[PDB]
Amino acid sequence: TSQVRQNYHQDSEAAINRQINLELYASYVYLSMSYYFDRDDVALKNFAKYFLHQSHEEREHAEKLMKLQNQRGGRIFLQDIKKPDCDDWESGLNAMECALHLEKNVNQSLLELHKLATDKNDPHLCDFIETHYLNEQVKAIKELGDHVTNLRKMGAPESGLAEYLFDKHTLG
Amino acid sequence: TSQVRQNYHQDSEAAINRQINLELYASYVYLSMSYYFDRDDVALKNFAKYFLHQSHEEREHAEKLMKLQNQRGGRIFLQDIKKPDCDDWESGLNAMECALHLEKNVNQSLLELHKLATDKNDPHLCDFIETHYLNEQVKAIKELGDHVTNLRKMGAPESGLAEYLFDKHTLG
Amino acid sequence: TSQVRQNYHQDSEAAINRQINLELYASYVYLSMSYYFDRDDVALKNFAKYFLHQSHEEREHAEKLMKLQNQRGGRIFLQDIKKPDCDDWESGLNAMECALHLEKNVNQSLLELHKLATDKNDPHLCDFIETHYLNEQVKAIKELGDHVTNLRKMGAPESGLAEYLFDKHTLG
Amino acid sequence: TSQVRQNYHQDSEAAINRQINLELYASYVYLSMSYYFDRDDVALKNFAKYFLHQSHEEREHAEKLMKLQNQRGGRIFLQDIKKPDCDDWESGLNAMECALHLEKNVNQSLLELHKLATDKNDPHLCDFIETHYLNEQVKAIKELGDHVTNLRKMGAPESGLAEYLFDKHTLG
Amino acid sequence: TSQVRQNYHQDSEAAINRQINLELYASYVYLSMSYYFDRDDVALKNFAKYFLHQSHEEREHAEKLMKLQNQRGGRIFLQDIKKPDCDDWESGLNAMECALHLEKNVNQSLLELHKLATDKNDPHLCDFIETHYLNEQVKAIKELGDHVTNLRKMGAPESGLAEYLFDKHTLG
Amino acid sequence: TSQVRQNYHQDSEAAINRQINLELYASYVYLSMSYYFDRDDVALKNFAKYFLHQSHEEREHAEKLMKLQNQRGGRIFLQDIKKPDCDDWESGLNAMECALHLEKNVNQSLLELHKLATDKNDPHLCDFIETHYLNEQVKAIKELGDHVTNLRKMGAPESGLAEYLFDKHTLG
C-alpha cells in the first residue's frame, strides 16, 4: 500500500522487524554487562566502558534497520525487549564469552536474513546486509575471540591480577 | 552485604529499579514515535529528530539511575521493556499529547520515589532526585504543553499545513 | 574481440546500452520539468533548481554506465533520446508524482539488469549495480515520496500557497 | 498570452526551439566522441576529456537558450535528440574534423537565427545571439581548425605517435 | 575447531590459501619485471617504478587475504612461490602484455573463488571478494590494455623512441 | 658483455643472486610468523606488527641487492622462494628463537660473501656489504637475543602472562 514499495516481499519485512528486536536485545544485554562491572565489588572500569560502547553501537544498528524499513515502504512493528539471561556475569572472561556467543547468534540471524533476501531476489536488501552488518559482525566476533584467548592465557578466571591488567592494557 | 552501603533501604533500591525500567520504557516509546514520523506517508523530519533526541535523553536518565544504584551499593535487577502502546501515532499533535501524558506519568513515579526517600530518611537520594530529575521533568512537561497548545491553535488535527509549518519553524 | 573483455556476456552489454539510454531520457525529462517551473506563469524557482540538479545527476549516472561499458570491453551503441511525455507539467505536485513514477521505472529496469547479471554469473556487474545505483534509487524514491506526501497534506493541488511555502521551506 | 511577452514574434520562438534541439544534439555528439577515445583500443585520455568538456559546454548553451525562451514569454517545445551520425570516430583527426564541421553547421544555424531576428526588428534577441553565441562559435571554429592543422602537419592519420604526442602536449 | 569460525567451508579456506599463493607469485613476477628495466642495457626508469609499485600492491593484496583467513577462523598454509616464467622480458611492450595476461589469470582465479563462495552460501566472502578485488582487477586490466594499445600505436617493438617517450609522458 | 661491468667476477655475481634468494626467503618466514600471531587463538598484535615490520625490511634488503647487481653489470637470476619451515610457530619465545637462528644463518651467508669479495679483490662489493648489511645484521641479532633473554626470564613458555606483558611493554 506504500507509494515507495517495490520488490520488497512481506517475509523480508517480517524478518527485518525480528532483526530489529534482536539488535535491541543485544543493546540491553551489553547495558547489563556494562553496569555489572561498575559494581563496587567488581570495579573494572574499562570493562564497563567497553560494554557500554557496544550497547550504544547495537542501538545504532537497530536504528539503521528501522531506517531501512521505512526506506523500502515496510512498516515497523516493535515487540517486547526481553530482559538479559543473567544479572550476575561473574567475571570479565565469562562476560566476554557470553558476548562472543551473543554476537555469533546475531550473525546467524543475519545470515538467515541474507538467505531469505536472496531467495526473494531482493538485491538491495542483500547489499544493505552485506555492506552494513556482515563485516561488522565478523570484526566483532574476531575481536571478542582475541579478548577471550588473551584472558584465558593470562589465567583470568582464577587470578584477578590477570583481569586487572587486561582491563588497563587492552581495554584501557 | 555491600561494603559501601549506608542508609540505603531495600524499598528505595526496589523503587530505583522500577524507575530504571520506566525510563527505559520511555526511551522505547520515543523511539517508536521518532520512526513513525520518518514514514514516507508521514514525512515530518523535524518531528522525528525531536523524538529521537528525547529517546536518547531518556536512555541517559536510565543510565544515570543505574550509576546511582551502584554508587549506593544496591544491585540492579533489570526487567522486560514492554512494547509501546501504539504502532501508529496518527498525527504530530496526537504524538505530542501522548508524550505529555507519558512525561506526567514519569513525574508522578518520581514524586512517589521522592516521598519514599523522605519517609526512609535518605537525604542523599532525595537530593539526587531533586537535582537531576524533578526540574528536568517540569521543563519537559512545560515544553510539551507549549507544543500541544501551538499545534491546537494552528488547527493541527484537520490541516496538514499547520503540522508542516510547526515542523519547520518550531522543531526546525 | 576486446583484449580486456572477460566474463562479460553480450546480453549484459546490450542491457547496459539500454540502461544508458534510459538514464539519458531521465535527464531529459528532468530538464523539461526544470524549465517548466522557470516559466513566468509558474515561477517556482526552487522547484526548477531541484529538477535541474536531478537532470545533471542523471547525466552523471549515464556517463558512469558508459565508463563501465568501456572498462569491461563492451562497445557503446547510442540511440535516439525520446522527447519527454509532457510539455506542461501542470503543478509542483504533478511533477513530483511523475518524477516518482519515472524513478520507479528506472529502478525496475535496474533490477532486471541485476537479475540478468546474476543469471550470467557476472559478480563484477552485480556489485557495480548494487554499489552505484540500487541504494541511490531507493533514496531518490523515498525522497520523492516524502515530497509528494507533504504536498498532498498541505493541500497543494488546490491552493498555490501550499506550493509556494513548500518551495521556500523544503526545496529552499 | 504571456504577461511578459513583448516584441517577440512567433517565428523567433520556433527558431529558438530548433536551436535548442541543435545544441542538445551537439552535446550528444560530443559525448559519443568523448567515450570513443576512452575505449581500450583507442586509449587517448586527453582527447576524451576535451570532448567531454565540449559536451558539457553545449549543454550549457542549450540551457541558456531555454532560459532566454522563458525570459521573453515564449514556450519551450522539446523534440527527440537524434543519435549521432557515427559510433566509431576512427581517429583523433577524424573526430576533430567532424567537430569542426558540426560547429560550422551550428554557426550557420545561428546566423540564420540572427537574420530572422533582424527581419523581425527584435534588437534584444539579436544582441543576445551576438553577445553569447557568435564570438564563442568563432573561437571554437578557430581552435578546432588549429587542432586539425597541427594533427595534419604531424602526419596524424598514418602515425599513432603524432596522435599520442598531440594528446599529451596540446590537449594535456 | 576455531572459536570464531561460522559459515566458513573448508573448500573456501583451501581456495583462499591458493589465492594467497597466486598473489605472492604476481608480486614476484612484477619484482622481476621491475628490475629488468633497471638494467643498464634497458634503462627505462619509469617502467621500473611502475612495475615495482605493482609488486608492492600485489604484496598488499596477499596480506589482505591472509588477514581475511584469520578473521574467519581458517588457517593459513603457505606454499613455495615459483620463480617467474621469464628472466629477460625483452621490451616494455612485451612486459605490458605479459602483465595483462597475468592479471587476467588472477581475475579468472578470483571469479572461480567467487563462484565457490556463492555455491557454499557464504555472503561475507562474496562481498569481501567483490569489494576488495573484483573492481581493482577490472581497473588494472583496463589500464594495462590502454598501455599496450598506446605502445602498439606508437610502433613500440621496432622503435625505441616510442618506448622512451611512453616512459616519460605516460609512466612519468 | 655489459658496458658498465668492471672488476666484477662471476662468482661474486652468483653469490649475490644466492643472497637475494636468502633475503626473500627471510621476508617470507617473517610474513608467516607475523600472521601466526594474528590468529584468534594466539592474538598477540604487537608480535604480529614486529614480524611484519621485519618482513618488509627483508624485502628492502633483497631489493637493495638487486639494485647492486644491476649497478655492477651483473644479471639477476631469480629462483623459487621456498616455503617456511613451520606453519605453527607455537609461542612468542619460540618465534623469537627461530628468528635469531635465521638471522645468524643470514649473517653467516653474508660473511662468506664478504670473504669471496675479498678473495676476488673487489673493494666496492666488500664496502657495500660492510656498509649496508653487516652492522644491520649485528644489531638485529643483538636485539633478538635481548628479546629472547627477557622472555626467558619472565617465564614465557609456561606463563602466557609473560608473553602478554612483553607484547604490551617491549613490542608496544
Contact A80, A18 (CB under 8 A): no
Neighbours of F96 (CB within 10 A): 27
Distance CA E6, CA E3 (A): 9
Neighbours of F8 (CB within 10 A): 19
- Of C149, C155, C169, which has the smallest distance from its Cβ to B43's Cβ? C149
Contacts of E126 (CB under 8 A, 6+ apart): A130, C123, E114, E117, E118
Residue C142 lies in a domain: yes
Which amino acid is located at D33 in the chain?
M
- Shortest CA distance to E27 belongs to which of B83, A62, F81, B2? F81
Contacts of B60 (CB under 8 A, 6+ apart): none
What's chain B look like in SS3? CCCCCCCCCHHHHHHHHHHHHHHHHHHHHHHHHHHHCCCCCCCCHHHHHHHHHHHHHHHHHHHHHHHHHHHCCCCCCCCCECCCCCCCCCCHHHHHHHHHHHHHHHHHHHHHHHHHHHHCCCHHHHHHHHHHHHHHHHHHHHHHHHHHHHHHHHCCCCCHHHHHHHHHHCCC
- D39·C70 Cβ contact <8 A: yes
Give the cell for residue F152: 626467558
Residue E72 lies in a domain: yes
Strand partners, A81: B81
Resolution value in angstroms? 1.8
- Shortest CA distance to A35 belongs to which of B31, B16, B26, B27? B16
- Of E142, E145, E154, which has the smallest distance from its Cβ to D164's Cβ? E154
Contact E163, E44 (CB under 8 A): yes
**Helices within A130-159 (DSSP H only):** 135-154
- Cα–Cα–Cα angle for A97, A101, A102, rounded to 5 degrees: 115
Distance CA C124, CA C126 (A): 5
Q: Note the residue count of chain E.
A: 172
In chain E, residues with a C-beta closer than 8 Å to the C-beta of D163 are: 153
Please tell me if residue C114 touches chain E, with a CB cutoff of 8 Å. no
- Shortest CA distance to C117 belongs to which of C105, C127, C126? C126
- Cα–Cα–Cα angle for C62, C63, C66, rounded to 5 degrees: 90
Distance CA E17, CA E70 (A): 11
What's E4-56 look like in SS3? CCCCCCHHHHHHHHHHHHHHHHHHHHHHHHHHHCCCCCCCCHHHHHHHHHHHH
In the block, cell 562559435 appears at D137
- Of A145, A147, A155, which has the smallest distance from its Cβ to F161's Cβ? A155
Neighbours of D132 (CB within 10 A): 13
Contact D42, D164 (CB under 8 A): no
Residue B21 lies in a domain: yes
Instruction: Report chain B's C-alpha Rg in angstroms.
Output: 18
Minimal C-alpha gap between B171 and chain A (Å): 20
Containing F85, the helix (H) or strand (E) segment is none
* CA distances for A17 relative to A24, A63, D51, E124, angstroms: 11, 11, 51, 22
Which amino acid is located at F66 in the chain?
M
Contact D91, D157 (CB under 8 A): yes
The structure's method of determination equals cryo-EM
Please tell me if residue E2 touches chain D, with a CB cutoff of 8 Å. no
Distance CA C32, CA C83 (A): 9
Distance CA B62, CA B40 (A): 31
Neighbours of A13 (CB within 10 A): 19
Helix, strand and coil percent figures for chain F, each rounded to 5: 70, 0, 25
Structural domain boundaries, residue A150: 10-170
The interface residues of chain E toward chain A in range 129-158, judged by CB-CB distance below 8 A, are: none
Residue F21 lies in a domain: yes
What spatial distance separates the first Cα and last Cα of chain F, rounded to whole Å? Answer: 51
Distance CA A78, CA E67 (A): 38
In chain E, residues with a C-beta closer than 8 Å to the C-beta of C118 are: none
- Shortest CA distance to E169 belongs to which of D164, D92, D162, D91? D164
Which chain E residue is nearest to residue C121, measuring alpha carbons?
E115
Contact F25, F82 (CB under 8 A): yes
In the block, cell 637462528 appears at F101
What's chain C look like in SS3? CCCCCCCCCHHHHHHHHHHHHHHHHHHHHHHHHHHHCCCCCCCCHHHHHHHHHHHHHHHHHHHHHHHHHHHCCCCCCCCCECCCCCCCCCCHHHHHHHHHHHHHHHHHHHHHHHHHHHHCCCHHHHHHHHHHHHHHHHHHHHHHHHHHHHHHHHCCCCCHHHHHHHHHHCCC
User: Under the phi-then-psi rule, with left for phi > 0, alpha for psi from -120 to 50, and beta for the rest, what region is B13?
Assistant: alpha
Please tell me if residue D169 touches chain C, with a CB cutoff of 8 Å. no
* CA distances for D69 relative to C27, C37, D18, D110, F132, angstroms: 20, 13, 12, 15, 76
Give the cell for residue D23: 545544441
DSSP character string of E80-148: -BPPPS-S---SHHHHHHHHHHHHHHHHHHHHHHHHHHHHTT-HHHHHHHIIIIIHHHHHHHHHHHHHH
Residue B157 lies in a domain: yes
Distance CA A109, CA D166 (A): 59
Residue D3 lies in a domain: no
Contacts of F70 (CB under 8 A, 6+ apart): E35, E38, E39, E40, F76
Please tell me if residue B66 touches chain A, with a CB cutoff of 8 Å. yes
In the block, cell 558539457 appears at D56
In the block, cell 621469464 appears at E86
Strand partners, C81: D81
Which chain E residue is nearest to residue D40, measuring alpha carbons?
E146
Task: Tell me which DSSP letter residue A86 carries.
Answer: -
Neighbours of A121 (CB within 10 A): 14
Distance CA C97, CA C89 (A): 10
Cα atoms found within 13 Å of the Cα of residue E132, Cβ hemisphere only: 18
Which chain D residue is nearest to residue C73, measuring alpha carbons?
D40
- Cα–Cα–Cα angle for A13, A19, A21, rounded to 5 degrees: 110
Distance CA E123, CA A12 (A): 17
Residue A122 lies in a domain: yes
Neighbours of D127 (CB within 10 A): 11
Q: Using CA of residue D154, residue D158, residue D159, residue D163, what is the dihedral sign?
A: positive
Distance CA E149, CA C38 (A): 48
Distance CA A78, CA D34 (A): 53
Distance CA E32, CA E162 (A): 23
What's A6-45 look like in SS3? CCCCHHHHHHHHHHHHHHHHHHHHHHHHHHHCCCCCCCCH
User: Under the phi-then-psi rule, with left for phi > 0, alpha for psi from -120 to 50, and beta for the rest, what region is E90?
Assistant: left
Which amino acid is located at A137 in the chain?
Q
- Shortest CA distance to E77 belongs to which of E27, E140, E125, E14? E14
DSSP character string of chain D: --TT--S--HHHHHHHHHHHHHHHHHHHHHHHHHHHTTSTTT--HHHHHHHHHHHHHHHHHHHHHHHHHHHTT-------BPPPS-S---SHHHHHHHHHHHHHHHHHHHHHHHHHHHHTT-HHHHHHHIIIIIHHHHHHHHHHHHHHHHHHHHTTTT-HHHHHHHHHHT--
- Cα–Cα–Cα angle for B162, B166, B172, rounded to 5 degrees: 155
Q: Note the residue count of chain C.
A: 172
- Shortest CA distance to E145 belongs to which of C71, F58, B19? C71
Neighbours of D130 (CB within 10 A): 13
Neighbours of D138 (CB within 10 A): 12
In chain C, residues with a C-beta closer than 8 Å to the C-beta of B165 are: 165, 169
Containing F7, the helix (H) or strand (E) segment is none
Residue F157 lies in a domain: yes
Contacts of F5 (CB under 8 A, 6+ apart): F72, F73, F74
Collapsing DSSP to helix, strand or coil, F81 comes out as strand
Distance CA C156, CA C166 (A): 9
Please tell me if residue A31 touches chain B, with a CB cutoff of 8 Å. yes
Whichever domain contains A35, its CATH number is 1.20.1260.10
In the block, cell 573463488 appears at E113
The number of folded domains in chain A is 1
Distance CA B109, CA D4 (A): 68
Give the cell for residue E8: 566458513
Contact D163, D152 (CB under 8 A): no
Q: Using CA of residue D8, residue D11, residue D12, residue D13, what is the dihedral sign?
A: positive
Distance CA E152, CA E129 (A): 33
Interruptions in chain A after residues (C–N over 2.5 Å):
none
Neighbours of B121 (CB within 10 A): 10
Q: Note the residue count of chain B.
A: 172
Distance CA A34, CA A55 (A): 8
- B40·A75 Cβ contact <8 A: no
- F35·E73 Cβ contact <8 A: no
